[PDB]
UniProtKB/TrEMBL annotation:
A molecular function (GO) term: ferredoxin-NADP+ reductase activity
Organism: Brucella ovis (strain ATCC 25840 / 63/290 / NCTC 10512)
Segments forming domain FAD-binding FR-type: 2-102
Name of this chain's protein: ferredoxin--NADP(+) reductase
Reaction it catalyzes: 2 reduced [2Fe-2S]-[ferredoxin] + NADP(+) + H(+) = 2 oxidized [2Fe-2S]-[ferredoxin] + NADPH
Length: 257
């Protein structure tokens, strides 16, 4: 240890039997940029049992928040699902990640495309002042299999526009687009199918991707990333990085083990 900060679990909310969210304290010395991730976990036998976790809380918040998977035989999330108020976790002290504004060229639009727990880095980004100073529109798209998997669906639409520090920017600039595949819902299908059929652009009121105006952030499943990366690169969009900004950056929501 001592490369970690000890934080106390303050709140827990389970969404389904596979998806929960818990908030913790935040160390005064802990500083991070929106879209980054850290190594988060538990102290087991005096050794760090951690996995990669996007930071889902805003930088303006006095605390940290994590949007987590619950896997039955998973080394971390089998113990982590049984967290309670007062429990201790460890968080690494060196943030890292590709989902940075500076890896993207200046633009008029920012498309945050996520499936499942890939919403988590964008929960930090949409609750940041600077994204709304740099992009005219922020379109958040969240793809899930079931309606119950739409974590934070009421906080984004009902409570986030009411924010006394960020609300008017959310009302005017944030577009939220939830889609569900395997249950009846107002929107249906994969987000990749929605980009193909052109329905994504019909539903949000904005024109198709073009190399001048649209910048994109992708965080989701391996199938969704490779598929959408082919969509974007065959259209002429290039992948940015710290040393060479571009139009889209990508981050793995998980890796199949
Ligand atoms: C950059 C990065 C950021 C990440 N951010 C988050 C985050 O914010 N929240 C989070 O819950 N996980 C996140 N992950 C995934 C993280 O590794 C999982 O917490 C971890 O794999 C599951 O813990 P485990 O040890 O119990 O299971 P593991 O032994 O690591 O994996 C068990 C199984 O669960 C699957 N799995 C893992 N994570 C997910 C997921 N999110 N959705 C669906 N299936 C999954 C794996 O494919 C595997 O088959 C991130 C991964 C990376 C690389």
């Amino acid at each position: 240890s001592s490369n970690f900060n000890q934080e106390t679990v303050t709140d827990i909310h389970h969404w389904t039997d596979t998806l929960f969210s818990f908030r913790t304290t935040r160390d005064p010395g802990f500083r991070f940029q929106s879209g980054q991730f850290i190594m988060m976990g538990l102290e087991v036998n005096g050794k760090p049992l951690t996995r990669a976790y996007s930071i889902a809380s805003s930088l303006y918040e006095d605390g940290l928040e994590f949007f987590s998977i619950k896997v039955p035989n998973g080394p971390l999330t089998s113990k982590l699902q049984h967290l309670k108020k007062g429990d201790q976790i460890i968080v690494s002290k060196k943030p890292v990640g590709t989902l940075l504004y500076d890896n993207l060229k200046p633009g008029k639009h920012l498309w945050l495309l996520s499936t499942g727990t890939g919403l988590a880095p964008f929960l930090s980004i949409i609750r940041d002042l600077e994204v709304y100073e740099r992009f005219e529109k922020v379109i958040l798209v969240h793809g899930v299999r079931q309606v119950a998997e739409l974590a934070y669906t009421d906080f984004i639409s009902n409570e986030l526009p009411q924010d006394e520090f960020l609300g008017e920017m959310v009302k005017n600039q944030l577009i939220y687009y939830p889609t569900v595949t395997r249950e009846p819902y107002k929107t249906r299908g994969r987000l990749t199918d929605l980009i193909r059929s052109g329905q994504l652009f019909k539903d949000v009121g904005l024109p198709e991707f073009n190399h001048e105006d649209d910048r994109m952030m992708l965080c989701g499943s391996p199938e969704m990333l490779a598929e959408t990366k082919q969509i974007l690169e065959e259209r002429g969009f290039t992948e940015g990085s710290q040393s060479e900004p571009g139009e889209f950056v990508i981050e793995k929501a998980f890796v199949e083990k």
